[PDB]
Structure formats: C-alpha cells, structure tokens
Amino acid sequence: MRTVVAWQETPPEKDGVRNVCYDLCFKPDGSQVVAGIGNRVLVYDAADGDLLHALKGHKDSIYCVAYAQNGKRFASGGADKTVIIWTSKAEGILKYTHNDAIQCLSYNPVTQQLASATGSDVGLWSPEQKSVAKHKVASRICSISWTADGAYLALGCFDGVISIRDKGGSEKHRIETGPSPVWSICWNPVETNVLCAGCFDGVLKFYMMSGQQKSKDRELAFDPLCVSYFSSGEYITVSGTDKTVHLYTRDGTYLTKIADRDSWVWAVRPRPKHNFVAVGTEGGGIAMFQLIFSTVHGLYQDRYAYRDQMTDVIIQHLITEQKVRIKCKDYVKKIAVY
Amino acid sequence: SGEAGVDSAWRGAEAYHFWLLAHRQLYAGNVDLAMRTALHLREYEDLLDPVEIYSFLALAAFYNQFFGQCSKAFIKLESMPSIPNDKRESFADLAMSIF
Amino acid sequence: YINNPREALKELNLARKDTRWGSQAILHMVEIYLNPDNDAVWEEKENADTPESRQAVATARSLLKQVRGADTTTQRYRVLESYAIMAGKDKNEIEASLNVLLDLANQDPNNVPVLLAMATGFMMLKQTPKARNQLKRVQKIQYKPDEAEEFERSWLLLADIHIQGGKYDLAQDLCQKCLKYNKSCAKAWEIMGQIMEREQAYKDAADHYENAWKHENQASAQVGFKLAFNYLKARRYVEAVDVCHKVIKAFPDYPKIRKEILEKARMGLKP
C-alpha cells in the first residue's frame, strides 16, 4: 500500500477555546469536511484543507456537528444547551435552545431533520423550526444516528443499550451491546442496518437492527474514540488512544496505518465515496489521507494475482477467470505466481 | 594432528577456550585460575600471540605477588624481550628494585 | 540520573576491579542510601523520615568501609558516615547524629551536604528556621556551578520550608528552576504541580504529575489521584483517559480508575 497524506492542518484558534476537533461530518459528496473544532464550525475542504468558513455561533465549545445527509445544512451542538444550524453556504439560520447540553448530532436523509441528543433529551430540529422536539429518555441519549433511508433514528442510551427510535422518539429496540454504553454509533449513509457500536472497551461491534453483530466483534489494541467503515463497509478506519487511524478489513484484520498524527483522533470519518478520511485530532489537526489501493500482483502469465479485500488475494486465472480468493486474513504485501 | 588424548583432541578450540577462560577470570576475581589456564596456553602460545600470554601471566602474576612467579615474570620481562621495550624496561627497573 | 538503581547497582558491583574508579563507585553505592539525585520533600502536607533504616545504617557502615584508594576519610565520606548515623533514626540518636554532623558542618559552613544534613536533622526534629539558616548558608558561597543539582536540592529545600511558612509561588518558580540542572526532577514536578494547584492551574499541574510519574519509575497513585483530579475538573470530556493509561502503567491496581475518570470515560468520547 501507500496512505498518502492528502493534507494536514493545525486549526486556527479564536474565542479562547480548547483547540480540539470535537466532531467530523462530511458533505455527502465529500468536498467540504466540516470539523466542529472548539466552539467553531471550522469548515474546510477535504481535498485541500483551506478554512472556507470559521463559524463562531456557539457560546461554549461545540461538542458535536453533523452535516445534512441530504446535503443542505450542517448544525453544531455544544455544551451551551443550544444548537446553531449552518446551511451549506455556512450561514447561521437557526439557534434553538434545548433543556440539556448537546451530546451528539445527526440529520435526516429525507429532510433536514437534525436530531440533537442532549444530556436528557434529543433536540429534533426540523429543517426550519425553532422548537426542541425532545426525546425524554430515562437513560442519557449518548449516541444518535439516522438510517440512510430517513425513517429510523437510533438513540443510543447510557445503559449499554442502543434504543433505536423513530422521528418522534419511540423506543423500539434494546440492542444488547453489553455493560458498556455506546457513545459512538453511526449509521453508514449507505447501510441502514449496520450500526457501528464502537465503545471505550475496544470491542468493535457492528450491530444490526435488533442488536446482533455483523462481523466478529473485534477487541482493539487501543480504546477507540471513533470507529467508521471505510469504502462503504469493506474496510474500517479505527481511531482512538493510539494517536492515529488504522485500516482494518471488515472482518477486523489489520491492513495499514492510515494516519500519522499528534494526538487523539476524537472523530474518524472516511470521505464519502473517496479514498480520504477525516482525521481530526485532540489538537484539532484535521487531515485527509489517500488510502489508494494498488492491485499488487504477481503473474505467471495466466493467474492474475491482484490483491483484493487487502487481506485476501483474488487471483484470477485469466484462462478461466476463477475469482475465488485466498483467505489469508492478514495484510498482503507482495505476491508472485509460478 | 593434535595433542594426545580425546580431551586434548581439539587443542586449538581448547586453547582459545582456556584463553577466554583466562580473560574472563582476570576480572572475575579468579586471577590465579586465569594464571593456571594461561599456563595451559604456555603450551598453546604457538597458535595465539605468545607475547599476549606472556604479558598476561607476567603482569597479572607479579601483581599477584607470587614471588617465584614474580622472579620468573621478571626474567621474561628482562631476558629475551618479547614484551615491548618500554614496559619491558619498566619492569626491568622494577626487577632491579624488587629482585 | 534517570532513577534506575537496579542496572546501575549491577554495573557498580562489577566496578570492584580498580582502586579509584571502583573507589568512587563504592562511594556512590553508599551515597545512594540517602542521596540518589536530590531529596527536598519537606513540602506542606509532606514529611521525610526513614525509621526502617536501622538496617540501612548497618549496610551503610558495612559497604561504607569498602571504599578503595583514599576515600576512607573525606568530608563527603565522614558526612556519609553521619548519613548512616542519622539513618539510625531515633530521636535522641538523630540529635546525636546532628551534633556529630555539627562537628562536621561547622567545618565547612558553605558546603551543600553538610548543611543539607543540618537541614534534614532540623526538620525531622521540626526546627525549620534553623534548617532555613543552614540552607541559606549553603548558598553563602558565590555562584560556582559545581554542585548545581545539589544547589537545586537546597533551593527546593528552602522553597518547601517557605511553603511551610505560607507562601506558595516562590517554591513553584524554584521547582521550575530545578528543571535547569537536571531533566529528571520528579519530586520537583509533583511539588510545583501541587503549588500551581494552589494557584488554580491544574492541567499544567497534571502534566507535571505525569512527568513525575515518568521519572518515579511507574509510581502515580496519590500522584495518580491528583493527576486524575486535575484531568477531571477541567471538564474536558474525552480526556482523563490518557491519565487512565498513565496510572495503570503506574499501578495496574490503581483504585481511582472509575471515579475521577469515568466521569470522563463514557462521559465523553466525542461528547
């Protein structure tokens, strides 16, 4: 492989806030990487990194940001009990005050129905409302995400259970993550049923609708602050107390070191339908990385041994083109055919 | 061939085993056993540097104050000088002082 | 210098083959009984006494006399003999050691170890103004950088007696000055950290505490306590888990591993 640094930048500091890239959300094409750093929405571009907009709408530090999944707005949730919504032009349109400090944000794919999990409720922000359509859950809503179809909003609760709910906040599922509550869930914007239940204990839970895993629940070598699916669920960008981002096959087998950074990658997010990843650090340093996958191959003129799934090799015997991969389950470096 | 006996068969490897034994025992508190296993190389001085074993025995046996071996060491350190003439003459002066 | 006495003592035990370098080696294995790098720990809410050293005096007098060359009677060596003597560590025996040292410290009332032992004797007997006077006449000599680490030890000793007086920030800047003549001052790090904690600065205090843990050979439990305490009060939600890793590297049985950090662990992680 090679994981080229697309760009890497220390964020600007203003309003006297801790320079931490708290949350990372993407425009659905992946052009504007929207990093909520400190109390700012430091809007960059995920190909260059230039600060397109420094959006200083919050009072306290912005704990969380989320772009519209349909691509119209990006909001900002902080500890100041409000959420300031910025359009795709990065202009503050709505600022609605909740009943608790914001824990996480998520937007609808159908409309701009932002969900804003507070410490006691979830501030469902309809595309133009000033109201807080709260989700009074007895357990603290620690993680939210909207399914890519635009109907379900999984309110991960501070009880070890991801309580998947609707756009009105009705409990439907009791996802059995275990004793650890899951502050980091994310519906993949292409997968409505794959919930990445990343916790602090290291367990890589790729949970389904009712609470069953997809792949093996891998115990990471580091406590992960964010786990995300690279290449729409084939690869995994894990980022935690390891100061960087690793690449893993969706089995949970190591591929390469994605990031090379300074501090805690609080949020990791692949650039959607790209090779890049949002690596924003505890120092706020946001960095895309070119996860370019070369078909490393040997060839005895008939068995084209191109590496695919990056722990396996899909060797196609070009006379027959039988594409049955070799289950190495470990990262392939160089290949040759006799 | 080699020295008589299976215990003296690999007399070159035995020679350097006893020499590394001497080198280790010179700084492990076993300087006298280093002298004995360098008297082992008094036969095995041909394959190694004879001046090395000679100076080893002479300058860690005189400093062990074995007076007969002190006299023999100063005989070697004055007669037939294989020891370099600076330290050979220094220990010659010591022989003219001690003996 | 980095506080690794095991490998250092293994090295020094094989140094018994020369009469002068082995002599200073043996002087060092008996000097480490009371002074490895520096000892200025008479801060407020702190004290220093070693009643277990009834065997340390025995081994100090045993390995004491084994010094080679001409080292069996120096001012450093006789003050090390009296180091074993107050390491006998009985109150009347500490007074006797102080008097024997006073026959030694008044010989050179400008040297650091003699009046430093004055200070230690005067502070484990609580006469701290006398220790202040003895450490002020430590630096009665002009600025010659020959005992710069020992100068730092005496400066921090005056600093912690000043802490006992009531003022804080003076010892903070003296402990910052301690970073000049050695890059491994863990006791200074913990001390300055406590001082800034008094003047409302806590994240830097925790950084000093974890540096101290780095140079206390994986020792941060109460240091780890104030580590996690300073990591917690700033309400930086994803934080206080680096200090979790730091204190479980200190002690895997660290007992505060779910109260000052689990208000940050699971109360955070992209909060």
Overall, the morphology of chain A is globular
Question: What multimeric state do the chains show?
Answer: part of a larger assembly
Q: Note the overall shape of chain C.
A: globular
Helix amount of chain A:
under 10%
Q: What is the SS-derived class of chain C?
A: mainly alpha
| Major interchain interface with per-chain residue totals | A-C, 23 and 13 residues
* Distance between the amino and carboxyl termini of chain A: 23 Å
Continuous helix count of chain A: 0
Order of helices and strands of chain C: HHHHHHHHHHHHH
Instruction: Provide the succession of SSEs of chain A.
Output: EEEEEEEEEEEEEEEEEEEEEEEEEEE
Lateral strand order in the biggest sheet of chain A? 1-25-24-23
Family (chain C): Belongs to the TTC21 family.
Organism (chain C): Chlamydomonas reinhardtii
Protein name (chain C): Intraflagellar transport protein 139
Protein name (chain B): Intraflagellar transport protein 121
Short structural summary:
This is part of a larger assembly, with chains A (338 residues), B (99 residues) and C (271 residues). With 338 residues, chain A is mainly beta. In chain A, 0% of the residues lie in helices and 40% in strands.
Describe this structure in words.
The structure is cut from a larger assembly and holds chains A (338 residues), B (99 residues) and C (271 residues). Chain A has strands at residues 2-9, 21-26, 33-37, 40-43, 53-55, 62-67, 73-78, 82-87, 92-97, 102-106, 115-118, 141-143, 152-157, 161-166, 175-176, 195-198, 203-207, 218-219, 224-230, 235-240, 245-249, 254-257, 267-270, 277-280, 286-292, 303-307, 313-317. In chain A, the strands form eight sheets. Chain A has a four-stranded antiparallel sheet with strand order 1-25-24-23, with no helix packed on it. In chain A, 0% of the residues lie in helices and 40% in strands. The radius of gyration of chain A is 20 Å and the shape is globular. Chain A is an all-beta fold and 338 residues long. By secondary structure, chain B is mostly helical. Chain B has helices at 11-25, 31-39, 50-61, 67-76, 85-98. By secondary structure, chain C is mostly helical. Helix content of chain C is 56%, strand content 0%. Chain C is built from 13 helices and no strands. Chain C has helices at 5-13, 21-31, 56-64, 75-86, 91-105, 112-124, 128-136, 148-165, 169-177, 186-198, 203-214, 222-233, 242-250. The interface between A and C is medium-sized, with 23 and 13 residues. Chain B: This is Intraflagellar transport protein 121. Chain B: It is found in: Cytoplasm, Cytoskeleton, Cilium basal body. Chain B: Residues 7-99 form the IFT121-like TPR repeats domain. Chain A: It is found in: Cell projection, Cilium. Chain A: This is Intraflagellar transport protein 122 homolog. Chain A: Residues 15-190, 199-292 form the IFT122 first beta-propeller domain.
